[PDB]
């Protein structure tokens, strides 16, 4: 398993919220960031296993390039375990 | 030694400040991310030796549990070194 | 390559917002997290080879010296792959 953690810098930014929610990373949460002039930032983050790591890549990417693309960076990191806890509403 | 980090969604949300708070976990930090319908969720991390991990996860959902629960992730990850340093006040 | 976090409580703060951008720590990026009295916290983030890694901590404590430096904590994590984009402006 693999955490994935993506820092992008919004040009056509809500543009790339749109993007982001379009593109169907299910699980992935995001927050702001800031890098440095200090600029705003998205950082995205979602665990995956092993086999999905590059097809989430592709999505990100794809989906930052319908806004920016701009400037960005994204870590693929191990991970050791994952408890995942869903309760019906 | 590990991380722990917990992305969980707040039902009774200021029920599960508290429980945070109450649940005395020493040196957790917290901060707001968001998944998807927006949801504003809280990040939990931590970074502990291996043989506390199981106790620290049990503490997390124990207080989970106290406000919502809901729907929660929980990742452990793996950490190389570490340095923490204290200054009196 | 590692990934570096710290998180660290400033004390003369805007004497360490001031501390981080004049360290000269390209590509960090920050945000703010809560520690417990909910502290608030600056979280940085950056990932580096790992030739790189002692350079970085020691530029990090310097910055934080200047401030506070008060508490603080440095940890060091593996990440498998990284995936760096720049478009021109
Ligand atoms: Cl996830
Ligand atoms: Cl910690
Ligand atoms: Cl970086």
Redesign the interface.
């Known amino acids: 398993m693999?955490?994935i953690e993506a820092?992008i810098r919004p040009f056509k930014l809500d543009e790339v919220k749109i993007a982001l929610?379009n593109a169907g990373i299910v699980?992935?949460?995001?927050?702001?960031?800031?890098?440095?002039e200090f600029l705003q930032?998205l950082?995205l983050?979602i665990?995956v296993e092993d086999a999905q790591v590059d097809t989430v890549?592709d999505k990100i990417?794809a989906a930052?390039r319908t806004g920016?693309?701009?400037?960005?960076?994204?870590?693929?990191?191990?991970?050791?375990?994952?408890?995942?806890?869903?309760?019906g509403e």
């Open positions: 693999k955490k820092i929610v699980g992935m949460t995001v927050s702001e960031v800031r890098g440095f930032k950082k983050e665990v890549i990417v930052a920016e693309i701009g400037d960005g960076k994204i870590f693929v990191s191990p991970v050791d375990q994952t408890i995942r806890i869903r309760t």
